[PDB]
Design a binder for this molecule. Structure first.
Ligand SMILES: [Mg+2]
Ligand SMILES: [Zn+2]
Ligand SMILES: [Zn+2]
Ligand SMILES: [Zn+2]
Ligand SMILES: [Zn+2]
Lengths: 175, 170, 138, 56
RNA sequence: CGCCGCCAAGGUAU
RNA sequence: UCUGGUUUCUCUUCAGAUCGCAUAAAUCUUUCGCCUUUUACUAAAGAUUUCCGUGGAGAGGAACAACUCU
C-alpha cells in the first residue's frame, strides 16, 4: 500500500452528541498534554452543554466551544490561558482535525474549532490536539450549511447535548 | 445521522501501516506460482501410478510465468514529465530526419501536467428631467418644448443631424 | 520516560521524582521555542542554565545535605540527570560558582586563554554588564 | 516506512518519552547459565571490572 | 558440475 | 627495617608478526569477455598507494592512590 496516514498514534477517546449526530473525537494526549487535559476536563464537567457552533466558514473551519455565542467567551480550568503546543507531524493538511482557537499569542481556553479542508494558513499558529474517527466525520460535515446570514452565526446553530468520556487517562476531578 | 459503535479502540490498525500487504494482483494461494507448486508437488507424489484417470485437473495430465509480486513493498514511483516530441514536426510540419527520428512525430499542442498544476492553483440637451420624453424618426427621445426650440434653432436633429422633415411624434 | 537502566531505583527517588520531572518539563519548554528575538546563542543559554541548576541541585543534595545515598547519586550521574566530569571540576578548591564547561577549554578560545566569564568582578573594571557568548552570563 | 515531503519524525517531541517495547531477550535460566546471567544482555558486558576486562 | 541482471553524454539548437 | 602503581585522556617515532585467525576500493602496465565512442564494465596476473583499525614506545596530568606487587 501507499496511502501513508502521516500522523502519530492517538491515545484517549471521547464521545460528543449534537443534533447533527454523534462525533467520536480521539486525542493525542502524549503530543499535547495540556490542551487534551483541558478538553477532557471540560467534557467531564459537562461544560459544553447548550454550547452552540457560532462560526462557520465552509471549506475552511467550523468553530465551537463558546458558551456565550459571541466569539470571545473562553474560560480554561487553569485560571489563565495556556501555551501553544506544536508538532511537525500534526499539521492542517486535511479535514476532521480539532484545534484550539487562538488570537495571536499563548491564549487558549475552551474556544476551539473543527477543520473542513486544507488550512495551510493556520500552520504553526494553533494547537492540534485531536481528530475524528471516520464513519462519523459526516455528522460534523453536516455542520457546514450556507445559512450563515453574515460571515458567521447562522439561523439555528447546532448545540452539544452531551459529552461522554470513553477513555480517561491522567485521572482528574470536576473542580 | 451516523451513530457510533461506542468503543475505545482507534480508527484503524495498531501498526499504522507497518504491514502493508500490496494485494493488487492475484493473492498467495491462488497465484500461478502456487498453482505451479501444487502441480509440481502432485507430479512428485504420483510416480508409481500409471494413468489412473482421476485426472487431477487440467495441467496434471502428465515458478516461471506469472511471478509473485513482493507483498512487502510499494514501487518507488516517479513522475516522468519529460515528453519525446518531434518539435520540428509539431510546430513546423517537416522533420529533417523523416522516419529515422527516434521521437514521436506528434502535432497535438495540448497542455501538459505541470501546466494544469500551476493553472489549478489560481433629457440630455438641456440636462433636465424628462418633460414629456418623446421620440423622432430615428429613436431620439427628446422633450416637447426643448425640441420645439431646437427646431426653432435648426430644422434637423441634434445627435446625428437627421432630416426630421417636420415629423415629430411621441 | 526513558530510564535505560531497568533498575527500579532505591530510596530516595520518590521525593526527587516530581522536582526533577518539573525540571525536565521546563527543559523541554526551553528546548521547544523558536529562535525569533533570541539572536544567535541566547536561545542556547537557558538549556545550559537549566542543566547547571539540575546538576547543582543534585550537587548540594548529595555533597552538602548528605541525605541521598551514593548509589542513587551514581545512578543519577549514569542516567543523565547529572554529569561526571563537571562535578569533578566543582570538587576543586578555587571555584564552584561555574557556568558550564565551555570556559575551561583553553583551545576553544583561539587566543589560547580562558573566557571573561571566569574573572573576578572585584578586580575587573567597575561598570560593564558583559555576558559570555558560549555560556550566557556572569 | 514514511512518505515523501515529510520531515524525519523530529526526534525532540515524538518518542523522547516513549519506551521501547521489547528486544529479543532470551530467558536464561539459573544453575546452568549462572555466571553469565548478570551480564549477557548489556551493551558493555564487562567494563567497570578490573578482574575480567582491561578497562574503559 | 548450472554464464548472464545497465546508467548517462550521443537531438529537438545559442 | 628500607624498597613503593593499575586504568583513562593528549604527542612520539619505529612497524615486518595470519601488523587484522577478515579484507574494501582506486591508479598504472598487460591479457581477455561484452563492446560503437567513452565514462559506468567483466576477471586473472604483475606493483603500488589510498582508506577502516591494530602492535610497542618517550612525556604530561587526572581517576581510591595509598590498596599494596616488590
Ligand atoms: Mg565524438
Ligand atoms: Zn523527429
Ligand atoms: Zn563558569
Ligand atoms: Zn556556562
Ligand atoms: Zn564565559
Amino acid at each position: 500500500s501507499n496511502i501513508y496516514i502521516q500522523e502519530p498514534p492517538t491515545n484517549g477517546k471521547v464521545l460528543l452528541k449534537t443534533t447533527a449526530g454523534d462525533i467520536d473525537i480521539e486525542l493525542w494526549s502524549k503530543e499535547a498534554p495540556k490542551a487534551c487535559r483541558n478538553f477532557i476536563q471540560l467534557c467531564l464537567e459537562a461544560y459544553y452543554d447548550n454550547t452552540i457552533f457560532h462560526r462557520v466558514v465552509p471549506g475552511f473551519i467550523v468553530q465551537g466551544g463558546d458558551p456565550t455565542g459571541t466569539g470571545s467567551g473562553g474560560e480554561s480550568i487553569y485560571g489563565a490561558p495556556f501555551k501553544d503546543e506544536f508538532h511537525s507531524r500534526l499539521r492542517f493538511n486535511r479535514r476532521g482535525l480539532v484545534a484550539m482557537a487562538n488570537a495571536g499569542s499563548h491564549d487558549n481556553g475552551s474556544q476551539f474549532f473543527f477543520t473542513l479542508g486544507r488550512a495551510d494558513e493556520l500552520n504553526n499558529k494553533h494547537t492540534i490536539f485531536g481528530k475524528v474517527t471516520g464513519d462519523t466525520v459526516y455528522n460534523m460535515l453536516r455542520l457546514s450549511e450556507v445559512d450563515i446570514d453574515d460571515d458567521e452565526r447562522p439561523h439555528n446553530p447546532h448545540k452539544i447535548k452531551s459529552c461522554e468520556v470513553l477513555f480517561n487517562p491522567f485521572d482528574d476531578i470536576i473542580p | 445521522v451516523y451513530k457510533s459503535t461506542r468503543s475505545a479502540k482507534p480508527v484503524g490498525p495498531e501498526d499504522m501501516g507497518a504491514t502493508a500487504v500490496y494485494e493488487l494482483d492475484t493473492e498467495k494461494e491462488r497465484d500461478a506460482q502456487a498453482i505451479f507448486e501444487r502441480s509440481q508437488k502432485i507430479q512428485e507424489e504420483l510416480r508409481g501410478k500409471e494413468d489412473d484417470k482421476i485426472y487431477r485437473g487440467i495441467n496434471n495430465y502428465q515458478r516461471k510465468g506469472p511471478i509473485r509480486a513482493p507483498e512487502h513493498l510499494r514501487a518507488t514511483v516517479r513522475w516522468d514529465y519529460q515528453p519525446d516530441i518531434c518539435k520540428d514536426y509539431k510546430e513546423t510540419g517537416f522533420c529533417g530526419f523523416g522516419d529515422s527520428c527516434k521521437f514521436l512525430h506528434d502535432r497535438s499542442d495540448y497542455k501538459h501536467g505541470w501546466q494544469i498544476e500551476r493553472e489549478l492553483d489560481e433629457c440630455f440637451i438641456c440636462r433636465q428631467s424628462f418633460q414629456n420624453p418623446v421620440v423622432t424618426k430615428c429613436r431620439h427621445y427628446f422633450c416637447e418644448s426643448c425640441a420645439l426650440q431646437h427646431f426653432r434653432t435648426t430644422p434637423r436633429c441634434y445627435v446625428c443631424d437627421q432630416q426630421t422633415n417636420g415629423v415629430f411624434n411621441p | 520516560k526513558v530510564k535505560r537502566s531497568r533498575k527500579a531505583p532505591p530510596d530516595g527517588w520518590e521525593l526527587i521524582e516530581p522536582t526533577l520531572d518539573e525540571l525536565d518539563q521546563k527543559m523541554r519548554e526551553a528546548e521547544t521555542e523558536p529562535h525569533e528575538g533570541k539572536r544567535k546563542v541566547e536561545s542556547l543559554w537557558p538549556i545550559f542554565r537549566i542543566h547547571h541548576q539540575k546538576t547543582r541541585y543534585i550537587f548540594d543534595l548529595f555533597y552538602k545535605r548528605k541525605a541521598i545515598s551514593r548509589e542513587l547519586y551514581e545512578y543519577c550521574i549514569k542516567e543523565g540527570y547529572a554529569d561526571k566530569n563537571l562535578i569533578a571540576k566543582w570538587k576543586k578548591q578555587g571555584y564552584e560558582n561555574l557556568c558550564c564547561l565551555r570556559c575551561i577549554q583553553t583551545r576553544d578560545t583561539n587566543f589560547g586563554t580562558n573566557c571573561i566569564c571566569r574573572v573576578p568582578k572585584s578586580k575587573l573594571e567597575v561598570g560593564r554588564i558583559i555576558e559570555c557568548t558560549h555560556c550566557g552570563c556572569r | 516506512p514514511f512518505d515523501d515531503e515529510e520531515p524525519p519524525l523530529d526526534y525532540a517531541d515524538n518518542i523522547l518519552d516513549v519506551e521501547p517495547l521489547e528486544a529479543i531477550q532470551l530467558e536464561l535460566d539459573p544453575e546452568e547459565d549462572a555466571p553469565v546471567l548478570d551480564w549477557f544482555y548489556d551493551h558493555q558486558p564487562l567494563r567497570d571490572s578490573r578482574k575480567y576486562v582491561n578497562g574503559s
